[PDB]
Amino acid sequence: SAMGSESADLRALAKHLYDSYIKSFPLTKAKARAILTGSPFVIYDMNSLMMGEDKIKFKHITKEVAIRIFQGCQFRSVEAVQEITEYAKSIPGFVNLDLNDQVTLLKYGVHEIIYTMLASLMNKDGVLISEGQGFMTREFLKSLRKPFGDFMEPKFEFAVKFNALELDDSDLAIFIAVIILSGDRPGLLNVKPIEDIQDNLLQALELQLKLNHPESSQLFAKLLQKMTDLRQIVTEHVQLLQVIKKTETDMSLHPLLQEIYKD
């Protein structure tokens, strides 16, 4: 109605999402970048990985090093799913969707969000682990045997390009909401209300980027192009997950643990 009210409503939505993102994700990009730019224990080879087991208490140990790193990543992704699920509840409209559509949106959205937020913890030379208490080098991850040596490298390649956009946590809170509210996920029952919510989130993202990054020509479009790129990264990751359970022998052992990590 009144002049400026549309801008104000979009800024209020942006602020709400940022405040919720702070409540849901303790290690924000701001906190991560401070750590990366200078202290965490550095894991830079297999010997320092064994020494790192002492300095930090990792929760996933019950094998060969490449397998154990992978299972440590899977433990952390399960924790991330619970944080992202909590965040999703604060996106206006989400909890009023059909319950099956909520589950579907999270099922098919969490991996894109995981790799988006992992970029916040990465620089060109490695990644923060254990809530910022450790740092594992990119070179060490690349040195793992096939097929684990190329598990993290496409994530680093994405992150260096993505981080060059210099998004902050207020930008990312809205970007992550836009990814969750994707009306093209397989099996959704009511697509229209999801696209309606996403329309409002896209309006909020566009205004946030125009105000926060006025010098960054067409940043909104560039960020949508990245959303397209994350789809590719996730499809590649799922391919490797199918390699690790066929090619890499270790299958029907510990059925309860298999259950926690089914999907």
Add this chain to the structure above:
Amino acid sequence: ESADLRALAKHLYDSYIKSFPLTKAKARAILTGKTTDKSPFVIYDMNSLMMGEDKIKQSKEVAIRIFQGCQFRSVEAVQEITEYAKSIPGFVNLDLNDQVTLLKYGVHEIIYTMLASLMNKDGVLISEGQGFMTREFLKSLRKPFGDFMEPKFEFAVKFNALELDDSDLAIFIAVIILSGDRPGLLNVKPIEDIQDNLLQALELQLKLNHPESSQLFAKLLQKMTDLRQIVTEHVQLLQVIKKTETDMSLHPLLQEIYKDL
């Protein structure tokens, strides 16, 4: 802190609806005839059990076949309960060995709690509500399966008299999972801290949802005596079954759960 506890209650109820397709509300609707679906098929003897083959969507002997049908239900329930447990705030952040231990020693307490939702004094819903198997038929089975469901029916009658609904049960089942006394837990204190918060939320939920029900919180917590007794008696029955039966193929999930330590 009251708002946090209500938010926790709401979160657990939502996760419970997402994890368990056959809720108590849906089961009660079926048992009382509310639904717009054909009434469940009633199995009350051998002949009707046989017809249940064709009315409802390996072992040829009756007792074993009933027993194996219970085992496959538990396998399904374990999958649903594990999905629910991961939603309990703090659970997936525990040491992974302790996550496994909590599921190993908690799933059957939850299975029998939720079995009561599908029971009345005369029988129990089976196959997603498609069938109803009578308590008297289950009592008739040959030894060692004589009265093997009777402790479950006795518990359910008393438990259902508490009048809990799904929103109450969601918090109760979380309290069960987060039990710091399970054998072999490595880090008891983080589990007790979560259970403390769940108990606070359960107390508030019961006072708000059942304001007229005196000491319902205490009476619900006392039902763990009944539940642990059911589990110990069932483990003992399994030991008898090992002696009285020939080859007993067991699902890998149940063999892990029943593996001693």
